[PDB]
Every structure is written in structure tokens, then in C-alpha cells.
Amino acid sequence: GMISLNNRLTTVSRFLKQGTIADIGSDHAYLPIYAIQNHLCECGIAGEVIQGPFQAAVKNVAANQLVDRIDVRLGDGLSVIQPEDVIDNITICGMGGPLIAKILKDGQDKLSQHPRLILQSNIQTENLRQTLQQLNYEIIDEIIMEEKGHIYEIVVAEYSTELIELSSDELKFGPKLLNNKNEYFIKKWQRELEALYHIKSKLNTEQHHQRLAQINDEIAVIERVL
Ligand SMILES: Nc1ncnc2c1ncn2[C@@H]1O[C@H](CSCC[C@H](N)C(=O)O)[C@@H](O)[C@H]1O
Structure with a gap:
């Protein structure tokens, strides 16, 4: 129309x-x-x-x-x-x-x-x-x-x-999107890695144990899947 x-x-x-x-x-x-x-x-x-x-x-x-x-x-x-x-x-x-x-x-x-x-x-x-x-x-x-x-x-x-x-990977990344890993999948999760490492530039490791544990686990998950 x-x-x-x-x-x-x-x-x-x-x-x-x-x-x-x-x-x-x-x-x-x-x-x-x-x-x-x-x-x-x-x-x-x-x-x-x-x-x-x-x-x-x-x-x-x-x-x-x-x-x-x-x-x-x-x-x-x-x-x-x-x-x-x-x-x-x-x-x-x-x-x-x-x-x-x-x-x-x-x-x-x-x-x-x-x-x-x-x-x-x-x-x-x-x-x-x-x-x-x-x-x-x-x-x-x-x-x-x-x-x-x-x-x-x-x-x-x-x-x-x-x-x-x-699975935890299928919930995070998508059970269908995992089967592909097209240029947009790669770009999204490279950008998320960049953002997570940038947060680490702003948080003192003496003062933010809880959030850094969560951030570091997320980085480890993304680095394994890319
Ligand atoms: N709890 C809710 N129930 C229904 N609509 C909601 C909502 N919370 C936000 N919205 C409405 O959802 C819209 C989000 S912006 C996106 C608009 C459109 N669906 C699109 O994809 O382009 C706005 O109209 C906002 O008022």
C-alpha cells in the first residue's frame, strides 16, 4: 500500500x-x-x-x-x-x-x-x-x-x-544465532567485549568485587564463544 x-x-x-x-x-x-x-x-x-x-x-x-x-x-x-x-x-x-x-x-x-x-x-x-x-x-x-x-x-x-x-550460551547468544555467527553477531559481541573492558577502566578492583566478578565471567563467556 x-x-x-x-x-x-x-x-x-x-x-x-x-x-x-x-x-x-x-x-x-x-x-x-x-x-x-x-x-x-x-x-x-x-x-x-x-x-x-x-x-x-x-x-x-x-x-x-x-x-x-x-x-x-x-x-x-x-x-x-x-x-x-x-x-x-x-x-x-x-x-x-x-x-x-x-x-x-x-x-x-x-x-x-x-x-x-x-x-x-x-x-x-x-x-x-x-x-x-x-x-x-x-x-x-x-x-x-x-x-x-x-x-x-x-x-x-x-x-x-x-x-x-x-543452555546458558543458548539463552545469552540465541540457539539459532549460535548456528550462524554472521558479521552482525561478531560485531554485536565484539562491541559488548569492548564495553565490558571499558567498564574495567573505571572500577577499582579493591572496591567492586561483586560487579567485577560478574563482568569478568561475562567477558570469559563471550571470549570462548567468539
Ligand atoms: N509497558 C508497556 N506497555 C505497552 N507499551 C509500552 C510499554 N512500555 C513502553 N511502551 C511503548 O512502547 C513503545 C516503544 S518505542 C518502539 C515503537 C515500535 N514498537 C517500534 O519498534 O518501532 C512506545 O510506544 C512506548 O510508549
């Missing part, structure tokens, strides 16, 4: 199943609008937690003539999900891993119909993989990509009738 998405969200859109998209913390509803204009989905829910983004989403849905196709809802995380909703995809993008984790954990009662989850994490994706484990979700695909110099991970997960246990 008419909206242009960035590569990050375009990449998320390629994982959408037909039917309904619920986009939590929606980008002025541009992902739901894009999905309906490109016939990826036929119905949308756009969840917003504050009034500014809420009103911007309402205006954007009206401007694209999709008032009867996209429901814009105010509420925190999955609280926007209503018991009558039939949802094929939940998308949670442009957030840190720990916040996506919290939204899924705190809203876990909302996942009873076992939608596909497409999560796009800006940092600390480990926490989201740990939560997906706890909710009987299984990672079926992962992408790591770069846009304007920032490295982003997309995690695609579906329900499993048995809990899938991931």
Missing part, C-alpha cells in the same frame, strides 16, 4: 501469520497498518501505554482509512488483550529484552490461545529467552541485523506442549 517501514520492522513483518496482529507498544500503529496494506494480516490491535502515542495511532489508522480493521487500545503490555480476541501474532518491538520479558511474564494469562510471538529486542535479549522458556515457548527463528549502526535481534517463538530447556 502506502506506508514505508524501516528494515527492522519490515524484517519482523516477514514472520507474520495470516489473520490478526496484536502489536504491543505500537509504533504510531505503522506495523499493523503496513501488515494490512500488504495483505499479511486482515485485522490489527495496536496497544499503547500512554496518551500521546495512543492518539497518534488513532489519527494514523483514520488517515489510512483502516478504522474498521485496526483497534487502538490504551493499556500496559498485554492488559490490552481481551478475552474475545483471536490473535495469530503478538509483536513486541523496539524495546529492551528485560521489558519484553516483563510484559510477557506479567501478561502470561493472555497467551492461552498460543499465538506466534515475534519479539524485536534492542539489548539484553537473554532475559526474554529465559521468560520464553518459562512460558513453554520455543524459539523457531532468530535474525540479527544492523540499521543506522545499531545491532538488533528478532526472536520468533511458538508454543510447545513441553518446556524447552536452553
Whole structure:
């Protein structure tokens, strides 16, 4: 149709199943609008937690003539999900891993119909993989990509009738991304190493035993996997 998405969200859109998209913390509803204009989905829910983004989403849905196709809802995380909703995809993008984790954990009662989850994490994706484990979700695909110099991970997960246990390396680096180790995987984790060694330039070893132990273990893990 008419909206242009960035590569990050375009990449998320390629994982959408037909039917309904619920986009939590929606980008002025541009992902739901894009999905309906490109016939990826036929119905949308756009969840917003504050009034500014809420009103911007309402205006954007009206401007694209999709008032009867996209429901814009105010509420925190999955609280926007209503018991009558039939949802094929939940998308949670442009957030840190720990916040996506919290939204899924705190809203876990909302996942009873076992939608596909497409999560796009800006940092600390480990926490989201740990939560997906706890909710009987299984990672079926992962992408790591770069846009304007920032490295982003997309995690695609579906329900499993048995809990899938991931190793400490699989939770930290991704069970699919480990199989690749593309230029963006290397760049992300070289940059994390640089940042961890830089923190060591600022912490006296006499005074920060606890944090340095954690930092040194993380460096050792990354140096083994690269
Ligand atoms: N607890 C929460 N529940 C729902 N939305 C939340 C939230 N905390 C933050 N948000 C919203 O999530 C958005 C994060 S910015 C990213 C926007 C879009 N998903 C994208 O990927 O480009 C903002 O709209 C912010 O208000």
C-alpha cells in the first residue's frame, strides 16, 4: 500500500501469520497498518501505554482509512488483550529484552490461545529467552541485523506442549544465532567485549568485587564463544 517501514520492522513483518496482529507498544500503529496494506494480516490491535502515542495511532489508522480493521487500545503490555480476541501474532518491538520479558511474564494469562510471538529486542535479549522458556515457548527463528549502526535481534517463538530447556550460551547468544555467527553477531559481541573492558577502566578492583566478578565471567563467556 502506502506506508514505508524501516528494515527492522519490515524484517519482523516477514514472520507474520495470516489473520490478526496484536502489536504491543505500537509504533504510531505503522506495523499493523503496513501488515494490512500488504495483505499479511486482515485485522490489527495496536496497544499503547500512554496518551500521546495512543492518539497518534488513532489519527494514523483514520488517515489510512483502516478504522474498521485496526483497534487502538490504551493499556500496559498485554492488559490490552481481551478475552474475545483471536490473535495469530503478538509483536513486541523496539524495546529492551528485560521489558519484553516483563510484559510477557506479567501478561502470561493472555497467551492461552498460543499465538506466534515475534519479539524485536534492542539489548539484553537473554532475559526474554529465559521468560520464553518459562512460558513453554520455543524459539523457531532468530535474525540479527544492523540499521543506522545499531545491532538488533528478532526472536520468533511458538508454543510447545513441553518446556524447552536452553543452555546458558543458548539463552545469552540465541540457539539459532549460535548456528550462524554472521558479521552482525561478531560485531554485536565484539562491541559488548569492548564495553565490558571499558567498564574495567573505571572500577577499582579493591572496591567492586561483586560487579567485577560478574563482568569478568561475562567477558570469559563471550571470549570462548567468539
Ligand atoms: N509497558 C508497556 N506497555 C505497552 N507499551 C509500552 C510499554 N512500555 C513502553 N511502551 C511503548 O512502547 C513503545 C516503544 S518505542 C518502539 C515503537 C515500535 N514498537 C517500534 O519498534 O518501532 C512506545 O510506544 C512506548 O510508549
